[PDB]
Amino acid sequence: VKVGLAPMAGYTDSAFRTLAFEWGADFAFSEMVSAKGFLMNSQKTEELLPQPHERNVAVQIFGSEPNELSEAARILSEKYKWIDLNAGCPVRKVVKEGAGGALLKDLRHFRYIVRELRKSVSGKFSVKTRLGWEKNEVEEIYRILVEEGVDEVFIHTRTVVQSFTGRAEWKALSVLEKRIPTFVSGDIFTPEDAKRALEESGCDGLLVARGAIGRPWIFKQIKDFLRSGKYSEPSREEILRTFERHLELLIKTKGERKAVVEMRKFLAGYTKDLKGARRFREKVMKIEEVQILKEMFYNFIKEVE
Numbered sequence: 001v002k003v004g005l006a007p008m009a010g011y012t013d014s015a016f017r018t019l020a021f022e023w024g025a026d027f028a029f030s031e032m033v034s035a036k037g038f039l040m041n042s043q044k045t046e047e048l049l050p051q052p053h054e055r056n057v058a059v060q061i062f063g064s065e066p067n068e069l070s071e072a073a074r075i076l077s078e079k080y081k082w083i084d085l086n087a088g089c090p091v092r093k094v095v096k097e098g099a100g101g102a103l104l105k106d107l108r109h110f111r112y113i114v115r116e117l118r119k120s121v122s123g124k125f126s127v128k129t130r131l132g133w134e135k136n137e138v139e140e141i142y143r144i145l146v147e148e149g150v151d152e153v154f155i156h157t158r159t160v161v162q163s164f165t166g167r168a169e170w171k172a173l174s175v176l177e178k179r180i181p182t183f184v185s186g187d188i189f190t191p192e193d194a195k196r197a198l199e200e201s202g203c204d205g206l207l208v209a210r211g212a213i214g215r216p217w218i219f220k221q222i223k224d225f226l227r228s229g230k231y232s233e234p235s236r237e238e239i240l241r242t243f244e245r246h247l248e249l250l251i252k253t254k255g256e257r258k259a260v261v262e263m264r265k266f267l268a269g270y271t272k273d274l275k276g277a278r279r280f281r282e283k284v285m286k287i288e289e290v291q292i293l294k295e296m297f298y299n300f301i302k303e304v305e
């Protein structure tokens with residue numbers, strides 16, 4: 001069973017991906033990369049690309065037109081060995097553009113895009129998608145991917161229209177004869193969720209997304225649980241050290257100012273269920289100096305114990 005960190009725009013940058021690998025994740029993905037922005041040499045897209053030496057990390061691209069996706073894939077293939085296509089995002093901005101989950105609105109057009117991308121991805125080509133645009137059409141979507149030579153598939157078990165409402169219907173993948181590595185995603189917050197999702201879907205592995213924000217040890221817990229039926233929670237000292245390591249990685253990769261801004265997104269997760277976390281978060285949300293943030297987090301933990 002393989003357990004990977006899902007792509008999460010705004011969260012899964014190189015620092016968080018690295019931290020996840022330091023807790024046992026098997027693989028990860030870049031934040032979604034606009035194919036058009038990449039071809040335009042935009043600064044924003046250039047900053048999202050993984051380094052070519054960064055192992056086991058896909059470059060996920062998004063777009064609505066076959067020519068931009070294929071061209072971006074051909075160019076990226078010169079340096080990256082694994083390209084993934086986002087065909088699941090329900091975000092309004094992305095769907096309005098006809099990208100992400102909007103690619104599932106017309107499966108004839110989806111097949112066209114997948115066939116053209118297959119020709120342009122020299123290495124491993126995967127697709128991350130959903131069950132369908134507005135209804136479960138996963139057998140057809142999966143058949144397209146297998147027939148067009150996709151190497152691996154990641155499926156968030158919700159339709160695009162549901163966004164994050166309703167539940168991840170893990171059993172929807174049980175009907176699929178898994179001819180290629182197939183991974184389940186959706187509502188995976190604990191090891192118990194991970195085990196049930198694997199059992200109901202019949203998949204080869206799973207992705208952790210919201211469940212890993214501020215909780216990178218979830219990868220080790222999931223593997224511990226699947227192997228032995230038991231897992232443990234991190235000590236307060238281990239939470240502190242993880243926060244410190246994450247912050248150090250953020251400073252190294254993005255500089256002090258940006259490190260503080262990015263870390264703000266993970267504080268709720270790191271302090272989850274810690275006495276007085278709400279008060280602490282309120283006090284640190286506007287702190288701009290990285291040294292002050294680090295000292296307050298240290299003070300908050302050592303006092304909790």
Ligand SMILES: Cc1cc2nc3c(=O)[nH]c(=O)nc-3n(C[C@H](O)[C@H](O)[C@H](O)COP(=O)(O)O)c2cc1C
Pocket residue numbers: 006007008009010011030031032060086088089128156168185186187188189207208209210211
């Ligand atoms: C903040 C955020 C950003 C996301 N960005 C991406 C993305 O860039 N690419 C992608 O394929 N999915 C993206 N996802 C979807 C996740 O990869 C995942 O499939 C989804 O959250 C369902 O898993 P979960 O319910 O276990 O969190 C995003 C999810 C979140 C919460």
